[PDB]
Design a protein around this nucleic acid. Structure first.
Ligand SMILES: Cc1cn([C@H]2C[C@H](O)[C@@H](COP(=O)(O)OP(=O)(O)OP(=O)(O)O)O2)c(=O)[nH]c1=O
Ligand SMILES: [Ca+2]
Ligand SMILES: [Ca+2]
Ligand SMILES: [Ca+2]
Length: 341
DNA sequence: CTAACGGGATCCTTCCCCC
DNA sequence: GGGGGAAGGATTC
């Protein structure tokens, strides 16, 4: 297998840069305002000019303005970014029928049937980089290797407008030397669990007893990491089908009053049913983010599709159950639909 | 009515009903 | 012993 992985660079900020090129060279920060107060919210992404000084995704807006008070702070316009993303994905489909769209800005291409070695796969990587910046003037990063995981690691390394190949021989040195926290699927809770077991490299998973590795990170992550360490990972590129659609809004103030929460729950349903855009769900989940950011959720499924009116009636019953069974004030209320037809 | 913070989605684990 | 569905967890974007 030769897998080609395309990852658009600083993508929300770069799209705003494309629609308004005067922004180029300046630090651009794309924020998600929450409306509790002024500048309440977080950073969706920033470009590298803003990232240089520590303004990156996740940190509060007010924190970013303390660091770069004169940066360009734009509100998030995600469906603008989605239509741009949709057009770029359609470009990628010319280079392989086997393609996996992983998120709004990442696609995996199986180029096994289109090139014979890495040298050609590298050249076609440049052909894709040019065509995207040709047709849409967006710089991307190409990562090429033998499986999805190392193709993504390659792109992580060359990330800002790069292209880089991890060959079979670098895969082996990476198995021995790459920090295991830098492996896709290993966040900090799992990474911290691995270090307390002594594992800091992928090869260490072969030396440890499986049951004690399984006992602390789970069966799936264990087989996953062992498979990578044995150089025997090879999940195929598959078309990913969106399995849920939802929306959760922050209330202007915390509450446990059913009548105060109901408008927000209903607006989540309105916006959620719009995003379904045709497509009928048979399962609904009411999702509450509590006082202290803890997410509670009650749902239920039906032998049939759910109309908007049933979504209204049932969300109230499911919301009542959340307050019946939890004592925390709710801070954000939302809804998720799944199990489509 | 301005208060130390978004939002969307996936896969997996755990528990419990059930064959 | 396992298949299945609900709610919680960890991840990533
Ligand atoms: C990391 C991250 C990204 N995003 C959004 C913003 C990005 O435009 C999009 C893809 O994110 P990423 O690909 O993870 O980051 P990026 O594209 O903005 O920067 P990079 O060049 O390093 O890839 O997802 C979030 O909303 N929250 C997050 O925590
Ligand atoms: Ca990415
Ligand atoms: Ca990206
Ligand atoms: Ca990590």
């Amino acid at each position: 297998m030769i897998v080609l992985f395309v990852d658009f660079d600083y993508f929300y900020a770069q799209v705003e840069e494309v629609l308004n090129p005067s922004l180029k060279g300046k630090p651009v920060v794309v924020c998600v305002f929450s409306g509790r107060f002024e500048d309440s919210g977080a950073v969706a992404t920033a470009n590298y000019e803003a990232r240089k000084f520590g303004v990156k995704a996740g940190i509060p807006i007010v924190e970013a303005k303390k660091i770069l008070p004169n940066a360009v702070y734009l509100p998030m316009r995600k469906e603008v970014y989605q239509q741009v993303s949709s057009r770029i994905m359609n470009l990628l489909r010319e280079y392989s029928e086997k393609i996996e769209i992983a998120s709004i800005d990442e696609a995996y291409l199986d180029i096994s049937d289109k090139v014979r070695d890495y040298r050609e796969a590298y050249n076609l990587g440049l052909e894709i980089k040019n065509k995207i910046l040709e047709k849409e003037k967006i710089t991307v990063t190409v990562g090429i290797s033998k499986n999805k995981v190392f193709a993504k690691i390659a792109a992580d390394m060359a990330k800002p407008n790069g292209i880089k190949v991890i060959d079979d021989e670098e895969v082996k040195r990476l198995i021995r030397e790459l920090d295991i926290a830098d492996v896709p699927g290993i966040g900090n809770i799992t990474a911290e669990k691995l270090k307390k077991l002594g594992i800091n490299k992928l090869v260490d998973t072969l030396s440890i007893e499986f049951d004690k590795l399984k006992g602390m990170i789970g069966e799936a992550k264990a087989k996953y990491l062992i498979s990578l360490a044995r150089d025997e990972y090879n999940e195929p590129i598959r078309t990913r089908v969106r399995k849920s659609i939802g929306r959760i809004v922050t209330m202007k103030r915390n509450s446990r009053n059913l009548e105060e929460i109901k408008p927000y729950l209903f607006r989540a349903i309105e916006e959620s049913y719009y995003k379904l855009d045709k497509r009928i769900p048979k399962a609904i989940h009411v999702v509450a983010v509590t006082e202290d950011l803890d997410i509670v959720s009650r749902g239920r499924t039906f032998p049939h599709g759910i109309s908007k009116e049933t979504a209204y009636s049932e969300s109230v019953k499911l919301l009542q159950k959340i307050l019946e069974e939890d004592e925390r004030k709710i801070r954000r209320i939302g809804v998720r639909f799944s199990k489509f037809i």
